[PDB]
Symmetry: none
Subunit: 172 residues, 2 copies
């Protein structure tokens, strides 16, 4: 094509993908660190990266390709952007109520009780860090997609058989 | 008052519980390492410690007491024995076929897909470590309790409203 160019994100990726163009949660964690997506904030944990791989692992290989990495970057940027509009104090952490308003604006639709529940799960010393916030986000997106694809009748309710429920949530 | 003896596990605990007699996840990691419960080399990662503290934090303090530690030790040994039964090459790690064996002898009857989902998410590099096997055991227990708890028809199928499905999985 006439307007082709080198993708700036490929370098970070190629540096850890080796010769098969695929990366695991460990490698994903390293290249994301270099990419600097976590701005000033602390680097992502291996667990959060594990959730990230799972969220985009369409063929269940426990790995991720460059195109998937590109998707992730787009998504993580959106969430950090949203997180930023709440970390006024620029503390690298956010308030429980600020979290309720963050989730609601980014598209999620949870009840006050559910939000309270989620806030409690990721609250360390009253606050929610950037790492936990993102972890929360990928897991929310991940579980909501699955639920969504099982509810094409869009009734907000799905009958989960035990085996399906287990294989579904254990991945995230 | 005969038959009384010093509990052999008390040493590990008190060495870290400090004065208040409670331990958080980090200290739990240290106690468990000293007790030599984990294979022999690598200690449990912090997510798995968070999971174990959560599994026994009945008063929601984010800490654990000695009695809860003893109870944890009991559960941990039970799971570990099933692991040992199938770590044929005493590698300290198991593969997908071996994991389904440990899980089945433990009572679970998960499908190839469920077991494969578990393995891929918890796979350091093609086999599952004892550490991830435990974390996996803790989540499986929490999620299975949540599912059964809701099986009204006792048919192995649960009707999950979205909000409820979310709070249930996000709490683990």
């Amino acid at each position: 094509f006439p307007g082709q160019t080198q993708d700036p994100l490929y370098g970070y990726f190629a540096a850890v993908a080796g010769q098969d163009g695929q990366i695991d949660a460990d490698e994903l964690q390293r290249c994301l660190t270099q990419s600097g997506i976590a701005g000033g904030y602390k680097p992502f944990n291996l667990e959060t990266c594990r959730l990230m791989v799972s969220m985009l692992d369409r063929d269940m290989s426990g790995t991720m390709g460059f195109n998937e990495f590109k998707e992730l970057w787009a998504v993580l940027n959106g969430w950090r952007q949203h997180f930023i509009s709440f970390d006024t104090d620029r503390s690298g952490t956010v308030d429980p109520q600020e979290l309720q308003k963050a989730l609601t604006t980014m598209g999620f639709r949870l009840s006050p009780q559910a939000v309270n529940s989620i806030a409690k799960r990721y609250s360390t010393n009253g606050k929610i860090t950037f790492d936990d916030y993102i972890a929360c986000c990928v897991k929310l997106r991940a579980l909501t997609d699955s639920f969504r694809r099982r509810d094409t009748a869009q009734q907000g309710v799905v009958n989960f058989p035990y085996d399906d429920f287990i294989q579904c949530v254990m991945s995230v």
